[PDB]
Short mmCIF file of C-alpha atoms and ligand atoms in Angstrom, two decimals:
data_model
loop_
_atom_site.label_atom_id
_atom_site.label_comp_id
_atom_site.label_asym_id
_atom_site.label_seq_id
_atom_site.Cartn_x
_atom_site.Cartn_y
_atom_site.Cartn_z
CA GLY A 1 0.00 0.00 0.00
CA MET A 2 0.98 3.69 -0.08
CA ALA A 3 3.46 5.00 2.51
CA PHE A 4 1.43 8.23 2.90
CA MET A 5 -2.30 8.37 2.41
CA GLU A 6 -2.46 12.24 2.50
CA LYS A 7 -0.67 15.10 0.69
CA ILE A 8 0.69 17.01 3.59
CA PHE A 9 2.22 13.99 5.44
CA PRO A 10 5.76 13.94 3.98
CA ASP A 11 6.05 17.68 4.61
CA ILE A 12 4.97 17.32 8.25
CA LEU A 13 7.79 14.81 8.86
CA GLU A 14 10.33 17.38 7.58
CA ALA A 15 8.80 20.28 9.55
CA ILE A 16 8.92 18.51 12.93
CA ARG A 17 12.73 18.40 12.50
CA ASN A 18 12.89 22.19 11.70
CA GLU A 19 12.71 24.53 14.73
CA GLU A 20 12.41 27.63 12.46
CA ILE A 21 9.34 26.20 10.70
CA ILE A 22 7.78 25.27 14.07
CA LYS A 23 8.38 28.73 15.43
CA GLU A 24 6.87 30.35 12.29
CA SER A 25 3.91 27.97 11.95
CA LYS A 26 0.28 28.87 12.81
CA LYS A 27 -0.65 27.88 16.33
CA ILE A 28 -3.95 26.08 16.93
CA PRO A 29 -5.89 26.37 20.24
CA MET A 30 -5.84 23.01 22.10
CA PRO A 31 -9.67 22.56 22.17
CA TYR A 32 -9.54 22.12 18.36
CA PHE A 33 -6.62 19.71 18.54
CA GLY A 34 -8.73 17.64 20.91
CA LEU A 35 -11.82 17.90 18.75
CA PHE A 36 -9.84 16.34 15.93
CA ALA A 37 -9.05 13.31 18.02
CA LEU A 38 -12.70 13.13 19.17
CA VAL A 39 -13.95 13.20 15.57
CA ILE A 40 -11.44 10.61 14.27
CA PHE A 41 -12.14 8.22 17.19
CA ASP A 42 -15.82 8.27 16.21
CA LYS A 43 -14.61 7.18 12.74
CA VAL A 44 -12.04 4.66 14.10
CA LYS A 45 -14.99 3.27 16.09
CA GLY A 46 -14.88 -0.25 12.67
CA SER A 47 -11.68 -0.44 14.82
CA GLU A 48 -10.35 0.81 18.20
CA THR A 49 -7.33 2.43 20.01
CA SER A 50 -6.51 4.86 22.90
CA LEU A 51 -4.99 8.31 23.36
CA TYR A 52 -2.17 6.62 25.35
CA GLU A 53 -1.35 4.24 22.53
CA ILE A 54 -1.41 7.05 19.96
CA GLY A 55 0.90 9.10 22.23
CA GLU A 56 3.29 6.12 22.32
CA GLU A 57 3.44 6.14 18.51
CA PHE A 58 3.68 9.96 18.42
CA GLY A 59 6.63 9.72 20.83
CA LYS A 60 8.36 7.18 18.59
CA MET A 61 8.10 9.27 15.69
CA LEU A 62 9.44 12.36 17.47
CA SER A 63 12.42 10.13 18.40
CA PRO A 64 14.41 12.49 20.72
CA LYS A 65 18.03 11.39 21.18
CA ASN A 66 18.23 12.39 24.84
CA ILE A 67 16.43 13.91 27.78
CA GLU A 68 17.48 17.46 26.86
CA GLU A 69 15.87 17.04 23.42
CA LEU A 70 12.73 15.56 25.04
CA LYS A 71 12.47 18.68 27.22
CA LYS A 72 12.89 20.91 24.16
CA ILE A 73 10.15 19.17 22.15
CA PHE A 74 7.71 19.77 25.04
CA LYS A 75 8.48 23.52 24.98
CA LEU A 76 8.12 23.63 21.17
CA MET A 77 4.78 21.83 21.36
CA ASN A 78 3.69 24.30 24.08
CA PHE A 79 2.97 21.26 26.26
CA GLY A 80 4.87 22.70 29.26
CA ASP A 81 8.09 22.37 31.27
CA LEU A 82 9.09 18.78 31.73
CA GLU A 83 11.07 18.12 34.94
CA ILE A 84 13.43 15.11 34.56
CA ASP A 85 16.64 14.50 36.51
CA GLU A 86 18.68 12.55 33.95
CA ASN A 87 21.72 11.86 36.12
CA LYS A 88 19.44 10.30 38.76
CA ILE A 89 17.66 8.10 36.15
CA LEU A 90 21.09 6.85 35.15
CA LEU A 91 22.17 6.21 38.77
CA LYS A 92 18.99 4.75 40.26
CA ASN A 93 16.80 1.73 39.60
CA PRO A 94 13.26 2.25 38.23
CA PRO A 95 10.50 3.16 38.77
CA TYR A 96 11.23 6.87 38.29
CA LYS A 97 9.13 9.99 38.60
CA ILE A 98 8.94 12.89 36.24
CA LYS A 99 6.82 16.02 36.45
CA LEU A 100 5.12 18.40 34.07
CA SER A 101 4.62 22.15 34.81
CA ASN A 102 2.22 24.41 32.78
CA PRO A 103 0.51 21.51 30.89
CA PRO A 104 -2.46 21.88 28.52
CA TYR A 105 -6.08 21.69 29.65
CA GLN A 106 -5.74 23.74 32.88
CA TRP A 107 -9.34 24.95 32.28
CA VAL A 108 -10.32 21.30 33.01
CA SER A 109 -11.27 20.01 36.42
CA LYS A 110 -11.43 16.19 36.92
CA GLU A 111 -10.96 13.77 39.90
CA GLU A 112 -8.79 11.46 37.83
CA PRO A 113 -5.57 12.41 35.95
CA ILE A 114 -6.26 13.54 32.33
CA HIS A 115 -3.02 13.63 30.36
CA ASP A 116 -3.17 10.12 28.79
CA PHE A 117 -1.81 11.34 25.38
CA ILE A 118 1.18 13.04 27.12
CA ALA A 119 1.81 9.87 29.22
CA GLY A 120 1.94 7.82 25.99
CA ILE A 121 4.26 10.33 24.39
CA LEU A 122 6.61 10.01 27.38
CA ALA A 123 6.62 6.22 27.19
CA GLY A 124 7.40 6.32 23.50
CA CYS A 125 10.14 8.95 23.80
CA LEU A 126 11.84 7.19 26.73
CA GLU A 127 11.98 3.97 24.71
CA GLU A 128 13.60 5.85 21.78
CA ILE A 129 16.18 7.29 24.22
CA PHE A 130 16.90 4.28 26.47
CA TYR A 131 15.80 1.23 24.38
CA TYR A 132 13.72 -0.42 27.12
CA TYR A 133 9.93 -0.77 26.95
CA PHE A 134 8.39 1.71 29.40
CA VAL A 135 4.98 2.08 30.99
CA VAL A 136 4.10 5.62 32.17
CA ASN A 137 1.22 6.22 34.51
CA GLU A 138 0.06 9.68 35.59
CA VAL A 139 -0.55 9.60 39.34
CA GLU A 140 -1.11 13.33 40.05
CA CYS A 141 -2.49 16.04 37.71
CA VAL A 142 -3.01 19.85 37.57
CA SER A 143 -6.65 19.17 36.73
CA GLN A 144 -7.01 17.59 40.20
CA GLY A 145 -5.92 20.93 41.76
CA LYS A 146 -2.23 19.99 41.93
CA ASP A 147 0.52 22.45 40.91
CA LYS A 148 2.30 20.02 38.59
CA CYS A 149 1.39 16.73 36.91
CA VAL A 150 3.37 13.69 38.10
CA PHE A 151 4.16 10.59 36.06
CA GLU A 152 5.44 7.23 37.36
CA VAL A 153 7.92 5.60 34.85
CA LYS A 154 8.30 1.82 34.91
CA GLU A 155 10.61 -0.36 32.90
CA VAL A 156 8.88 -3.48 31.60
CA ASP A 157 9.52 -6.67 29.56
CA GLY B 1 -21.04 1.13 23.53
CA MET B 2 -19.68 4.18 25.38
CA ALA B 3 -20.51 7.66 24.05
CA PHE B 4 -16.94 8.85 24.82
CA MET B 5 -13.96 6.55 24.74
CA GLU B 6 -11.55 9.14 26.34
CA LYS B 7 -11.59 11.34 29.48
CA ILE B 8 -11.12 14.71 27.96
CA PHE B 9 -13.82 14.36 25.23
CA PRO B 10 -16.90 15.75 27.03
CA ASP B 11 -14.85 18.75 28.18
CA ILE B 12 -13.64 19.48 24.63
CA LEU B 13 -17.26 19.68 23.41
CA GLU B 14 -17.99 22.35 26.08
CA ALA B 15 -14.77 24.31 25.37
CA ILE B 16 -15.38 24.66 21.62
CA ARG B 17 -18.55 26.62 22.54
CA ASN B 18 -16.60 28.94 24.94
CA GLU B 19 -14.63 31.77 23.27
CA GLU B 20 -12.93 32.71 26.59
CA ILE B 21 -11.58 29.17 27.05
CA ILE B 22 -10.36 29.11 23.42
CA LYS B 23 -8.61 32.42 23.83
CA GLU B 24 -6.94 31.26 27.09
CA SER B 25 -6.02 27.76 25.89
CA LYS B 26 -2.47 26.64 24.98
CA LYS B 27 -1.77 26.97 21.28
CA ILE B 28 -0.09 24.08 19.45
CA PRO B 29 2.13 24.61 16.36
CA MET B 30 0.42 23.16 13.24
CA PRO B 31 3.22 20.65 12.39
CA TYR B 32 2.28 18.75 15.59
CA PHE B 33 -1.43 18.89 14.81
CA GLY B 34 -0.59 17.30 11.48
CA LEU B 35 1.70 14.71 13.03
CA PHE B 36 -1.22 13.56 15.14
CA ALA B 37 -3.30 12.88 12.08
CA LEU B 38 -0.32 11.13 10.42
CA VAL B 39 0.16 8.86 13.45
CA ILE B 40 -3.55 7.99 13.83
CA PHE B 41 -3.93 7.24 10.09
CA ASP B 42 -1.12 4.69 10.42
CA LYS B 43 -3.25 3.13 13.19
CA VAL B 44 -6.56 3.50 11.27
CA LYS B 45 -4.71 1.71 8.45
CA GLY B 46 -7.37 -2.14 9.93
CA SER B 47 -9.71 0.55 8.44
CA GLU B 48 -9.53 3.67 6.21
CA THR B 49 -10.72 7.33 5.78
CA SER B 50 -9.51 10.74 4.43
CA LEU B 51 -8.64 14.18 5.77
CA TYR B 52 -11.57 15.55 3.70
CA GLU B 53 -14.04 13.16 5.27
CA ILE B 54 -12.75 13.91 8.77
CA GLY B 55 -13.05 17.67 8.02
CA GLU B 56 -16.69 17.06 7.00
CA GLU B 57 -17.38 15.48 10.39
CA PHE B 58 -15.35 18.19 12.19
CA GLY B 59 -17.48 20.82 10.41
CA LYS B 60 -20.68 19.10 11.54
CA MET B 61 -19.69 19.09 14.98
CA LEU B 62 -18.70 22.77 14.97
CA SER B 63 -22.23 23.39 13.62
CA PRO B 64 -22.08 27.19 12.92
CA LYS B 65 -25.55 28.75 12.58
CA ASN B 66 -24.56 31.17 9.82
CA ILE B 67 -21.79 32.45 7.61
CA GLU B 68 -20.70 35.08 10.15
CA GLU B 69 -20.18 32.34 12.76
CA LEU B 70 -18.29 30.21 10.19
CA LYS B 71 -15.93 33.15 9.60
CA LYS B 72 -15.44 33.56 13.36
CA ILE B 73 -14.57 29.89 13.94
CA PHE B 74 -11.83 30.15 11.28
CA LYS B 75 -10.26 33.14 13.10
CA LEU B 76 -10.50 31.32 16.47
CA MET B 77 -8.86 28.22 15.00
CA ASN B 78 -6.13 30.47 13.51
CA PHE B 79 -6.99 28.94 10.13
CA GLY B 80 -7.22 32.36 8.41
CA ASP B 81 -9.67 34.90 6.98
CA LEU B 82 -12.49 33.23 5.14
CA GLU B 83 -13.97 35.35 2.31
CA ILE B 84 -17.66 34.51 1.69
CA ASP B 85 -20.28 36.83 0.18
CA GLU B 86 -23.43 35.55 1.89
CA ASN B 87 -25.93 37.82 0.13
CA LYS B 88 -24.62 36.58 -3.23
CA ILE B 89 -24.88 32.89 -2.17
CA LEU B 90 -28.50 33.60 -1.31
CA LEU B 91 -29.18 35.39 -4.63
CA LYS B 92 -27.26 33.19 -7.07
CA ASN B 93 -27.38 29.56 -8.16
CA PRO B 94 -24.47 27.25 -7.27
CA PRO B 95 -21.65 26.50 -7.76
CA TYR B 96 -20.14 29.25 -5.59
CA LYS B 97 -16.60 30.28 -4.81
CA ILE B 98 -15.11 31.12 -1.47
CA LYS B 99 -11.56 32.10 -0.60
CA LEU B 100 -9.18 31.69 2.30
CA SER B 101 -6.48 34.28 3.22
CA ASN B 102 -3.56 33.53 5.64
CA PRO B 103 -4.18 29.72 5.77
CA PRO B 104 -1.96 27.20 7.58
CA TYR B 105 0.99 25.45 5.94
CA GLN B 106 2.41 28.48 4.04
CA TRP B 107 5.89 26.94 4.55
CA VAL B 108 4.66 24.19 2.15
CA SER B 109 5.19 24.26 -1.58
CA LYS B 110 3.17 21.79 -3.72
CA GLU B 111 1.84 21.73 -7.36
CA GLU B 112 -1.56 20.50 -6.22
CA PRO B 113 -3.86 22.19 -3.64
CA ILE B 114 -3.21 20.97 -0.05
CA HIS B 115 -6.04 22.05 2.23
CA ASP B 116 -8.21 18.88 2.04
CA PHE B 117 -9.10 19.00 5.80
CA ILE B 118 -10.23 22.67 5.48
CA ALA B 119 -12.26 21.80 2.32
CA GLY B 120 -14.06 19.05 4.29
CA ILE B 121 -14.68 21.41 7.17
CA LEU B 122 -16.29 23.88 4.73
CA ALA B 123 -18.54 21.22 3.24
CA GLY B 124 -19.67 20.12 6.66
CA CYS B 125 -20.27 23.63 7.98
CA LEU B 126 -22.21 24.73 4.87
CA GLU B 127 -24.51 21.72 5.26
CA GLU B 128 -25.15 22.65 8.92
CA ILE B 129 -25.99 26.22 7.80
CA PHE B 130 -27.98 25.57 4.59
CA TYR B 131 -29.20 21.93 4.93
CA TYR B 132 -28.09 20.80 1.46
CA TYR B 133 -25.29 18.28 0.87
CA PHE B 134 -22.24 20.16 -0.43
CA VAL B 135 -19.06 19.11 -2.20
CA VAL B 136 -16.11 21.54 -1.81
CA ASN B 137 -13.11 21.30 -4.07
CA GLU B 138 -10.01 23.46 -3.66
CA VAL B 139 -8.99 24.70 -7.11
CA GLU B 140 -6.26 27.24 -6.18
CA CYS B 141 -3.93 27.24 -3.13
CA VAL B 142 -1.32 29.48 -1.40
CA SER B 143 1.06 26.52 -1.52
CA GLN B 144 0.95 26.76 -5.34
CA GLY B 145 2.28 30.37 -5.08
CA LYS B 146 -1.19 31.96 -5.08
CA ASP B 147 -2.11 34.78 -2.67
CA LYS B 148 -5.30 33.15 -1.42
CA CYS B 149 -6.75 29.63 -1.52
CA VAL B 150 -9.92 29.24 -3.61
CA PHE B 151 -12.67 26.68 -3.06
CA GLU B 152 -15.45 25.71 -5.49
CA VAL B 153 -18.76 24.93 -3.61
CA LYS B 154 -21.27 22.60 -5.27
CA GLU B 155 -24.68 21.57 -4.10
CA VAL B 156 -25.33 17.86 -4.59
CA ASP B 157 -28.00 15.16 -4.10
CL1 CL C 201 -5.10 24.15 26.90
CL1 CL C 202 1.22 26.49 9.61
ZN1 ZN C 203 -1.99 16.00 34.19
ZN1 ZN C 204 -4.89 25.96 0.05
#
């Protein structure tokens, strides 16, 4: 079958590698980014997936070479300030904890953590960086009234 | 089955109706919005769809009550300045022409028009407004070197 089913797709893969293009691009309000996913899940649903699993694939495709690059991608995406102590990850055994400051969807209040897409992204990116399969579970979230979101990172086989 | 398969989906439907929330939301650079679609089409592909057909559904869901509201949604989305003469649409027979100024993806150069998602959106929105089934075909595009994109609007049964 065809590598790319739509016209714009090869160009998007070039652009995500170009910080000047990202900085000059039009910015879309997050409610519309979410609406897209909502509309295409209605269409997925004769198949099925999750925002976490899509974030995993998204993360793979972003393919950051290191933690500093991971942090940079989150600023470029306007997804917030990712707090990761890399030297401690290297020194310690898992599970680890990482935090996100100034995340999207702060206008949302929910009892349960909301950032499933971001958690997937983090799992996917951490595999690209460190090789291991990771599972990332958000255990605290700004939308619960917390000041930062907190993610538990687990290495798995 | 469940109305909403993900946590954030009911909240997104409320937010798209709230201009204050849109204005205060985080803005995402368009290359990442496109990457999302690229990643979830790879996953769609054991099924199949198009950016045009998703735009149709997106348009339906936005459900603008009139042309002025359609124009406003495009500014809120940061998708550009939509040029539509409503009094002429009312007076004349189809097909019509509408234009878009300052669209996304101006860093893209392509021989063929690129704004398939926007063209779908327009078809879907025009059906919500006028009831008829519409087909919208982009016949000129900024990414061809033109100053504005141009869409042909056809009424169909
Ligand atoms: Cl937001
Ligand atoms: Cl853009
Ligand atoms: Zn969170
Ligand atoms: Zn165009």
